[PDB]
Design an enzyme around this catalytic site. Structure first.
Site, mmCIF file in Angstrom:
data_model
loop_
_atom_site.group_PDB
_atom_site.id
_atom_site.type_symbol
_atom_site.label_atom_id
_atom_site.label_comp_id
_atom_site.label_asym_id
_atom_site.label_seq_id
_atom_site.Cartn_x
_atom_site.Cartn_y
_atom_site.Cartn_z
ATOM 1 N N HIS A 13 0.769 -1.242 -0.156
ATOM 2 C CA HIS A 13 -0.755 0.070 -0.244
ATOM 3 C C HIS A 13 0.733 1.083 0.178
ATOM 4 O O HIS A 13 1.869 0.932 0.442
ATOM 5 C CB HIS A 13 -1.110 0.148 1.169
ATOM 6 N N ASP A 15 0.543 4.262 1.121
ATOM 7 C CA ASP A 15 1.081 4.562 1.749
ATOM 8 C C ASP A 15 2.482 3.695 3.759
ATOM 9 O O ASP A 15 3.216 4.835 4.165
ATOM 10 C CB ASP A 15 -0.057 5.210 3.659
ATOM 11 N N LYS A 16 2.488 2.169 3.073
ATOM 12 C CA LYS A 16 2.386 1.820 3.724
ATOM 13 C C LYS A 16 4.243 1.960 3.283
ATOM 14 O O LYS A 16 5.447 0.990 3.643
ATOM 15 C CB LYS A 16 2.297 0.413 3.900
ATOM 16 N N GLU A 41 10.969 11.605 6.201
ATOM 17 C CA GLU A 41 9.975 11.343 6.060
ATOM 18 C C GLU A 41 9.809 10.581 4.156
ATOM 19 O O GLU A 41 10.938 11.115 3.303
ATOM 20 C CB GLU A 41 8.641 12.631 5.724
ATOM 21 N N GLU A 54 15.567 15.820 7.785
ATOM 22 C CA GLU A 54 16.431 16.284 8.755
ATOM 23 C C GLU A 54 17.265 14.541 9.826
ATOM 24 O O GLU A 54 16.573 13.814 10.406
ATOM 25 C CB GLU A 54 16.450 17.218 9.773
ATOM 26 N N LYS A 151 -5.584 -4.454 1.270
ATOM 27 C CA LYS A 151 -6.303 -4.578 1.873
ATOM 28 C C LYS A 151 -7.094 -4.281 2.025
ATOM 29 O O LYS A 151 -7.942 -5.982 1.829
ATOM 30 C CB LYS A 151 -6.803 -2.803 1.872
ATOM 31 N N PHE A 221 -7.800 -4.907 -10.955
ATOM 32 C CA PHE A 221 -6.699 -4.618 -10.049
ATOM 33 C C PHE A 221 -5.181 -4.507 -9.741
ATOM 34 O O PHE A 221 -5.048 -6.012 -9.390
ATOM 35 C CB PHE A 221 -6.901 -5.169 -7.853
ATOM 36 N N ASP A 229 -1.287 7.619 -7.834
ATOM 37 C CA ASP A 229 -1.840 7.815 -5.840
ATOM 38 C C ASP A 229 -0.510 8.282 -5.885
ATOM 39 O O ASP A 229 -0.184 8.887 -6.150
ATOM 40 C CB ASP A 229 -2.028 6.435 -5.781
ATOM 41 N N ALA A 230 -1.095 8.518 -4.036
ATOM 42 C CA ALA A 230 0.370 8.528 -3.551
ATOM 43 C C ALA A 230 0.184 8.802 -2.505
ATOM 44 O O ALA A 230 -0.584 8.035 -2.007
ATOM 45 C CB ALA A 230 -0.038 10.430 -3.404
ATOM 46 N N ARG A 235 0.310 7.726 7.890
ATOM 47 C CA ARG A 235 -0.772 8.552 7.458
ATOM 48 C C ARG A 235 -2.015 7.597 7.093
ATOM 49 O O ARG A 235 -2.800 6.773 6.994
ATOM 50 C CB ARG A 235 -1.082 8.613 6.056
ATOM 51 N N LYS A 236 -0.768 6.197 8.130
ATOM 52 C CA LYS A 236 -1.826 4.451 8.600
ATOM 53 C C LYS A 236 -1.409 4.835 9.904
ATOM 54 O O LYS A 236 -1.228 3.601 10.311
ATOM 55 C CB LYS A 236 -0.477 4.215 7.619
ATOM 56 N N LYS A 256 11.184 7.954 12.665
ATOM 57 C CA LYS A 256 11.153 8.218 13.710
ATOM 58 C C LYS A 256 12.695 7.493 15.395
ATOM 59 O O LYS A 256 12.070 6.424 15.005
ATOM 60 C CB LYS A 256 10.640 8.883 14.730
ATOM 61 N N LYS A 260 12.631 9.839 19.667
ATOM 62 C CA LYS A 260 10.933 10.411 19.822
ATOM 63 C C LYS A 260 10.224 9.100 20.729
ATOM 64 O O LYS A 260 10.227 8.732 20.056
ATOM 65 C CB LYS A 260 10.731 10.363 19.022
ATOM 66 N N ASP A 262 7.237 10.058 21.148
ATOM 67 C CA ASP A 262 6.023 9.704 20.285
ATOM 68 C C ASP A 262 6.701 8.189 19.805
ATOM 69 O O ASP A 262 4.938 7.346 19.577
ATOM 70 C CB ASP A 262 5.565 10.476 19.094
#
Ligand code: CA
Ligand code: CA
Ligand code: CA
Ligand code: CA
Lengths: 373, 376
Positions: A13, A15-16, A41, A54, A151, A221, A229-230, A235-236, A256, A260, A262
């Site tokens: 996917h 995003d993955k 990123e 960075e 998915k 598919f 797509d992008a 984002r998941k 990260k 971090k 988070d």
């Protein structure tokens, strides 16, 4: 009867893809310099990858090799042809990473529940088992016509908090052009993906006798991934965690380094929650940690047991910070986080993994908790 | 007896790099919707030092607006206040690359909404206060009250709750970009206390929140002269908890910005906020989480579930029954009834999509309270 739906996606996917590239860069740097600071990123769209952010590192050779690390990850995912929508060997790769040589007010949540062996909520647990199995049957040649993007979605019906019926399973997968959806794809996915996962789980109360299975409900598919797509890193975050079942304080994981909070504190809270339920102190628990500027150790540790505690929840609250050392430096040391262990986390969930052993999933504090009660 | 619960939420200004991306994505959306209200838009934005990359896919008849996207990007950045390399970023002179595929012309789902009577805007108090502070921080920059401020900034709010009542404002952190010449201890800190913290607290006028011992920290990590994408990176959809309920409520997943209203991740989330807010405003509960369940092949929801956390004034089963009678939760109906095919989205891209006190949004209107009361 309450319905609950969660989803998962394969490593293919878009995003993955981004999460995996970000954490592949992280692992590459940590392998040479364990104390690298990394905030990387990734963006993908038709035919191209853009990696930015960075880094502070001594791992200059690994930094120089990032372009090749990106290509290799994309090829490992299985994107090796324009016919598939994306080719790691020939796609565009642009790197815009700033490189140099060498607390906070915070809240973070963790969750666990005894509805599955991995102590995860059933909808996301099942969705991840299915997305992992979907990829496994492609890579091991059982269903060689599959392609990387996919998915899974799982809807479960509950009655008085007991999962009683598997309502719907949707599996969408990329595949070769010559494949018949109705007579090849659907029964192969039912037999090799759904049924094998259901057999593995062998759930005691989940009735799967009238489950509605939908395979590729929107049809063919053939091309997938970033094509048309992008994707972006981070984002998941709900797929990465508890599938909507638990609260999330915010913050994505991938790209990260463990400094971090988070990432590292979210991992610690999962570890705490999983050990609490595995010790039988509650059947489900949300754990919340509070940090303050100027103090290493938490200024608060709160739980919610949703009526399922077998001991006073205030006692549980008291013993957690005695048994666990929740200073950030201690979490890093104790879970051994300064190691290249992150690319594997970037698909199929960070929590409840049945295919890999992660430090924050170890039940090594169950005995400690039992002694403290 | 339990220790008081602490809860922290945060907000960021329009100058935070992730919010720059949300704003650019929604500015592109609005530009397209202005010319073609039925445009399909899935537009993602990346920023890093000196550069913007806008990607994704669009189906539109708004070809002139599409051609003008590079200028829409630059204008949004300049509106945010990034007009100089001295500030870390200049909308007029930064790199802008567009990689958007363009053409001419349900699902198993769950979505949550939430409301609570802890604030006038019926939002959880930590996020509501965080957003009021981040809005006020920007306001005092743009209106000239504190003209040395620069765009990038972040607010954090920690509140103590005793038996569910917010009793104490524990800590407020305000981090803001500013001009190089400013004295942090003798200018920035007292100006922020007076013009941002104090004004927001007086606006809110909260009946139980004791602020007399609030620990205010202004730029605790020191000078903040350059900001934005400089030495950093932002992406669209990386502040989804800031955008919504600040961690207080559950989130089914899915970012908002850059997506046209046909994306149920946006429109159904908005509809669930609308439902929850009207339920509380109608006096049916003091707080509520609303969950909608959709199935492939059916327009209307197959389920509508609520949790009132012991605060319902009528049977929650009755609330569950009347919601789908009073609200038409078919995606096409939500789009029509909330009038979503309009350029109203750039304004949502910072300061939260829910609970806004500065702008009137369709999903925040209390125009279903009467309907709910008639249905009981
Ligand atoms: Ca069994
Ligand atoms: Ca032990
Ligand atoms: Ca009305
Ligand atoms: Ca009536």
């Amino acid at each position: 009867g309450r319905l609950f739906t969660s989803e998962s996606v394969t490593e293919g996917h878009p995003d993955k893809i981004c999460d995996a590239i970000s954490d592949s860069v992280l692992d590459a740097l940590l392998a040479q310099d364990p104390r690298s600071r990394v905030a990387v990123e990734t963006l993908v769209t038709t035919g191209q990858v853009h990696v930015v952010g960075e880094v502070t590192t001594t791992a200059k050779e690994a930094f120089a090799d990032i372009t090749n690390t990106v290509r290799e990850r994309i090829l490992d995912i299985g994107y090796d042809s324009s016919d598939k929508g994306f080719d790691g060997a020939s796609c565009g790769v642009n790197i815009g990473i700033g490189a140099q040589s060498p607390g906070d007010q915070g809240l973070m949540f963790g969750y666990a529940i005894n509805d599955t062996p991995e102590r995860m909520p059933l909808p996301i647990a099942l969705a991840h088992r299915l997305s992992r199995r979907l990829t496994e049957v492609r890579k091991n040649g059982v269903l060689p016509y599959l392609r990387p993007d996919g998915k899974t979605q799982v809807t479960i019906e509950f009655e008085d908090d007991v999962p009683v019926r598997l309502d719907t399973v949707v599996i969408s997968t990329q595949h070769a052009a010559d494949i018949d959806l109705e007579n090849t794809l659907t029964p192969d996915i039912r037999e090799k993906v759904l049924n094998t996962v259901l057999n593995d789980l062998a759930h005691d109360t989940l009735d799967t006798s009238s489950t509605r299975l939908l395979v590729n409900p929107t049809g063919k598919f053939v091309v997938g991934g970033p094509m048309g797509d992008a994707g972006l890193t981070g984002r998941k975050i709900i797929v990465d965690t508890y599938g909507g079942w638990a609260r999330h304080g915010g913050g994505a994981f991938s790209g990260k380094d463990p400094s971090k909070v988070d990432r590292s504190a979210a991992y610690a809270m999962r570890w705490v929650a999983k050990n609490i339920v595995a010790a039988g102190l509650a059947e489900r628990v949300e754990v919340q940690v509070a940090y303050a500027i100027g103090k290493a150790a938490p200024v608060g540790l709160f739980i919610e047991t949703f009526g399922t505690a077998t001991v006073d929840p205030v006692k549980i609250e008291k013993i957690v910070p005695e048994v666990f050392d929740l200073r950030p430096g201690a979490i890093i040391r104790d879970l051994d986080l300064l190691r290249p262990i992150y690319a594997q986390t970037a698909a199929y969930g960070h929590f409840g993994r049945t295919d890999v052993e992660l430090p924050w999933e170890q039940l090594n504090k169950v005995d400690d908790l039992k002694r403290a009660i």
